[PDB]
Design an enzyme around this catalytic site. Structure first.
Site, mmCIF file in Angstrom:
data_model
loop_
_atom_site.group_PDB
_atom_site.id
_atom_site.type_symbol
_atom_site.label_atom_id
_atom_site.label_comp_id
_atom_site.label_asym_id
_atom_site.label_seq_id
_atom_site.Cartn_x
_atom_site.Cartn_y
_atom_site.Cartn_z
ATOM 1 C CD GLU A 74 -7.960 0.709 3.062
ATOM 2 O OE1 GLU A 74 -8.599 0.552 4.127
ATOM 3 O OE2 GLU A 74 -7.045 -0.066 2.688
ATOM 4 C CG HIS A 80 -9.217 -5.692 1.591
ATOM 5 N ND1 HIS A 80 -9.482 -4.341 1.547
ATOM 6 C CD2 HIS A 80 -9.977 -6.257 0.618
ATOM 7 C CE1 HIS A 80 -10.382 -4.100 0.605
ATOM 8 N NE2 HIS A 80 -10.699 -5.246 0.027
ATOM 9 C CD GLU A 81 -5.368 -5.277 4.857
ATOM 10 O OE1 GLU A 81 -6.087 -6.153 5.376
ATOM 11 O OE2 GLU A 81 -5.849 -4.246 4.339
ATOM 12 C CD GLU A 125 -7.181 -2.654 0.270
ATOM 13 O OE1 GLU A 125 -6.566 -3.064 1.273
ATOM 14 O OE2 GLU A 125 -8.143 -1.859 0.337
ATOM 15 C CD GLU A 173 -3.023 -1.219 2.198
ATOM 16 O OE1 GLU A 173 -4.164 -1.683 2.017
ATOM 17 O OE2 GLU A 173 -2.626 -0.815 3.311
ATOM 18 C CG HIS A 222 -14.990 -7.634 7.557
ATOM 19 N ND1 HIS A 222 -14.699 -6.871 8.665
ATOM 20 C CD2 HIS A 222 -13.956 -7.466 6.698
ATOM 21 C CE1 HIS A 222 -13.545 -6.253 8.479
ATOM 22 N NE2 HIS A 222 -13.070 -6.599 7.293
ATOM 23 C CG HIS A 223 -13.796 -13.902 8.613
ATOM 24 N ND1 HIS A 223 -13.846 -15.135 7.999
ATOM 25 C CD2 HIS A 223 -14.920 -13.806 9.361
ATOM 26 C CE1 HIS A 223 -14.952 -15.760 8.364
ATOM 27 N NE2 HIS A 223 -15.621 -14.976 9.192
ATOM 28 C CD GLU A 224 -8.320 -6.611 9.583
ATOM 29 O OE1 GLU A 224 -7.190 -7.125 9.738
ATOM 30 O OE2 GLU A 224 -8.640 -6.028 8.527
HETATM 31 CA CA CA Z 1 -6.181 -2.111 3.416
HETATM 32 CL CL CL Z 2 -1.199 -4.684 1.258
#
Ligand code: CA
Ligand code: CL
Ligand code: CL
Ligand code: MG
Length: 662
Positions: free
Chosen positions: A461, A436-437, A455, A154, A356-358
């Site tokens: 974001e 994501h990540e 992502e 990112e 959603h699983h953060e």
């Molecule tokens: Ca992110």
């Molecule tokens: Cl990333």
């Protein structure tokens, strides 16, 4: 040994005259990749480096095509020449390995294939010697993000001389002084460490494998292959975009019938937390409540969205969720999120909940709960899950078999295997995964079609709080770097650009309104978010109609024109599926910080058919800093013999629906 693309323009020479095995590549008979080394070093095993000689070459070729279940195009053509070069070194400390090369008109892929042989048992690769030695690197220009940094993938892209790109992630894109564009990446990254590119002597990029915390790169037992290393080569920037090489280098679909994977559009309880109107954690401003979720589901049902993402539904977000990876539950909702009631409401409205699983980087806490978490979601009629691994570079947390915490990289062999385990387990529950990540895309969606998007780059974001937000050039960078890897969940479609104030010095998308619309055609993803608050779409219903109309699944895609970090124009033909007849074309164009005029031929439109173009473009006086909302919407009858002049404002764009007429 030599292998060439079908058209003859790309020529690879594989040699054993140098200290090690090596290869070089010419394009239209000009060397673009000089002699580049091949081989391995191991922790204990003797190296595969010098004194290997070519003993055998095996030539074959392919001219076939295959169909995607979903994608940017329905039919993928695979035309390449192939050579397998076998190297051998006599004892003592001898060995043998092969390298398989595939030469396409748009680039080359190669991989090592190390066979079973005496003394090759439990091995640990410490270095892959593969080089990409760029010819005339002193006059080449590169567009790149740094590797091994605290913020993973990112980063905004740097524009520098190639010799300044010291340690970089892939896809790694550059051009030489002749104007030839080249991009280095990899394909089918399975049970191996991701490749970072490390510039050694000037222009010599050496594979730099992302290691385990113990320091070795790749653990293998016996015979093994590497992922493919890929070198795209084209005379124009869009020739990189229009290649299928990454997909063509992956194994065919292993999941059988994947009709349960559904491309579509979604909204979410999400942006409100990023702009601080709601919280992820519990309290008076909690976003993830039954009442809020039903309100979003009603909006989705009314305006044609398939699902509602909800973040903050599960216990563990209270406080500073960045530090809460140890305490997340992936089965226990907050008391104000009634998942059984929302399951009933999803069936009544036809709008699905998107899970959603953060993890906040703690993959062991997730892994121990993962089976129960997917069982809950399957029971709750959830078909898509967004996962997350928010932690600084090198700070994935796992608990080893002795209960000791270790830190790992997101792109080492350990996490490469961890991501695929999650995707495979999700497939058993008929659940698709949006990571994501993530690990970067290497085309595995061909093999596992429920791995629908990720992502792995700065998305929308960062325009809420990036400090600074993404620059105007960002999309036109992504299109020729990150997007060469595969689809991206960018979450386009912000209609209220004013929540922090207008101008050039606030956290906001630094774009016009029409550029937000164009993103739905410029940035491919099988799922596309309408990222904004519902009330912000209700304020702009005419512009919102494009988002309501636009598909996310395409029979064909063509990057018509563009230049890295300046602009790109995409035309795509919708795939026949659900409500889409398959007859409409769509176009999206964006620019960087400069206003730009682009002449476009409409000869991509089907011959002999009439279309009504529904054109969403920057108003005459639009400019992103203080006048981003000026918008013109026009209807115009067109055919393939017509042309279009695109007039893009500063950080502007244009979106077009070409509606086929009966
Ligand atoms: Ca992110
Ligand atoms: Cl990333
Ligand atoms: Cl942006
Ligand atoms: Mg530019």
């Amino acid at each position: 040994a030599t292998v060439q693309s079908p058209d003859g323009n790309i020529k690879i020479i594989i040699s054993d005259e140098q200290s090690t095995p090596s290869y070089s590549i010419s394009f239209k008979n000009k060397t673009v990749i000089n002699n580049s080394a091949l081989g391995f070093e191991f922790k204990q095993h003797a190296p595969f480096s010098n004194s290997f000689k070519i003993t055998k070459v095996q030539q074959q070729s392919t001219n076939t095509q295959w169909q995607q279940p979903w994608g940017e195009r329905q039919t993928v053509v695979d035309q390449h020449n192939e050579v397998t070069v076998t190297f051998a070194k006599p004892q003592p400390q001898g060995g043998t390995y092969s390298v398989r090369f595939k030469a396409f008109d748009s680039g080359v892929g190669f991989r090592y294939e190390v066979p079973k042989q005496a003394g090759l048992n439990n091995i640990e690769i410490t270095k892959e010697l593969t080089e990409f030695a760029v010819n005339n690197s002193h006059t080449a220009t590169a567009w790149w993000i740094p590797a091994r940094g605290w913020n993973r993938y990112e980063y905004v892209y740097n524009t520098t001389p190639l010799n300044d790109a010291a340690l970089v992630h892939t896809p790694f894109t550059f051009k030489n002084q002749d104007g030839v564009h080249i991009s280095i990446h990899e394909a089918a990254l399975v049970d191996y460490a991701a490749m970072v590119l490390n510039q050694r002597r000037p222009g010599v990029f050496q594979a730099d494998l992302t290691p385990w915390s113990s320091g070795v790169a790749v653990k293998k037992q016996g015979a093994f292959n590497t992922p493919w290393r890929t070198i795209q080569i084209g005379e124009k920037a869009v020739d990189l975009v229009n290649s299928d090489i990454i997909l063509n280098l992956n194994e065919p679909n292993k999941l059988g019938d994947v009709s349960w994977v559904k491309p579509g559009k979604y909204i979410g309880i999400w942006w409100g937390m990023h702009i601080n109107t709601h919280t992820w954690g519990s309290g008076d401003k909690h976003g993830a409540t039954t009442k809020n979720t039903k309100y979003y589901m009603d909006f989705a049902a009314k305006y044609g969205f398939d699902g509602v993402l909800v973040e903050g539904w599960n216990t563990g977000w209270d406080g500073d969720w960045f530090f809460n990876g140890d305490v997340f539950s992936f089965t226990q909702p907050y008391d104000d999120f009634d998942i059984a009631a929302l399951t009933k409401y999803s069936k009544q409205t036809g709008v699905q909940l998107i899970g959603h699983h953060e993890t906040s980087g703690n993959v062991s806490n997730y892994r121990k709960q993962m089976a129960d978490a997917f069982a809950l979601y399957e029971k709750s009629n959830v078909s898509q899950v967004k996962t997350g691994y928010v932690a600084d570079g090198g700070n994935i947390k796992r608990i080893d078999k002795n209960g000791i915490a270790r830190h790992e990289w997101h792109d080492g062999q350990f996490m490469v295997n961890e991501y695929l385990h999650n995707v495979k387990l999700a497939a058993k529950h008929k659940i698709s995964i949006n990571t994501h990540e993530p690990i970067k895309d290497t085309g595995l969606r061909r093999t596992y079609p429920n791995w629908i998007t990720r992502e792995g780059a700065r998305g929308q974001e960062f325009n809420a709080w990036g400090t600074p937000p993404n620059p105007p050039e960002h999309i036109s960078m992504l299109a020729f770097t990150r997007m060469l890897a595969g689809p991206m969940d960018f979450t386009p479609g912000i209609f209220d650009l004013s929540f922090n104030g207008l101008g050039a010095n606030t956290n906001r998308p630094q774009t016009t309104l029409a550029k937000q619309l164009a993103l739905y055609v410029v940035l491919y993803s099988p799922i596309q978010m309408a990222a904004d608050l519902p009330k912000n779409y209700l304020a702009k219903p005419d512009a919102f109609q494009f988002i309501q109309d636009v598909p996310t699944d395409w029979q064909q895609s063509i990057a018509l024109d563009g230049a890295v970090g300046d602009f790109i124009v995409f035309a795509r033909k919708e795939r026949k599926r659900d409500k889409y007849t398959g007859n409409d074309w769509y176009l999206g164009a964006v620019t960087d910080e400069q206003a730009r005029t682009i002449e476009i031929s409409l000869d991509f439109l089907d011959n002999g058919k009439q279309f009504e173009a529904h054109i969403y473009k920057d108003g005459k006086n639009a400019e992103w800093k203080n006048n981003p909302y000026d918008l013109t919407i026009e209807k115009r009858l067109v055919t393939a013999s017509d042309k279009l002049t695109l007039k893009l404002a500063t950080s502007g764009g244009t979106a077009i629906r070409f509606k086929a007429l009966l």
